[PDB]
């Protein structure tokens, strides 16, 4: 299972680690990726987890959102985790960069509680612009699942973990 996480509450754990290898690793039941509406998955840890998926990722996603529409903000789709896990939990985080509401980061956290365990990166953090302390504040506050939590950063890890109430 998940090896060398810290534990922060009941239920969430915290790694320095890069997802995409952790996720090879371990092929957990779910990895969270950090989606924008459209499953556009060109960078940040959505291109890092398609790239891996040699863009198996990309093309299902697109069928998806060719049948669907987009996601909403704060919202998710269930889809293949194809070489890194069972399933892929496609998690739409509030992206500041991109002026969208910080409010609607809990919202997407929900998300996180119809899996009994996830491997997942922090949302709305890096390049969605929003502050990874606060990001881990709400995660903790909203996931009642078992969330490991993965962070590419060694100094936002020490940063994430050193700050922690
Ligand atoms: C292999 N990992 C990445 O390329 C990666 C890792 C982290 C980020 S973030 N969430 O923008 O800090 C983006 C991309």
Redesign the pocket.
């Known amino acids: 299972s998940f090896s060398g996480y810290l534990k922060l509450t009941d239920n969430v754990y915290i790694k320095n680690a ?4 952790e996720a090879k690793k371990v092929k957990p039941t779910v990895v969270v990726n ?1 989606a924008n509406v459209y499953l556009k998955h060109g ?3 959505a ?2 987890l398609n790239k891996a998926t040699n863009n198996a990722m990309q093309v299902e996603s697109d069928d998806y959102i060719a049948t669907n529409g987009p996601l909403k903000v704060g919202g998710s789709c269930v889809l293949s985790g194809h070489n890194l896990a069972k399933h892929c939990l496609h998690v739409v985080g509030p992206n500041v960069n991109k002026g969208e509401d910080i409010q609607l980061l809990k919202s997407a956290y929900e998300n996180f509680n119809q899996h009994e365990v996830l491997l997942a ?2 949302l709305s ?4 612009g929003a502050d990874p302390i606060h990001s881990l504040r709400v995660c903790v506050d909203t996931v009642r699942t078992n969330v490991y939590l993965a962070v ?2 060694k100094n ?1 890890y020490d940063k994430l973990v050193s700050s922690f109430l």
Do not use: Y
């Open positions: 890069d997802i995409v290898e950090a960078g940040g840890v291109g890092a990166p922090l953090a890096g390049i969605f590419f950063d936002l």
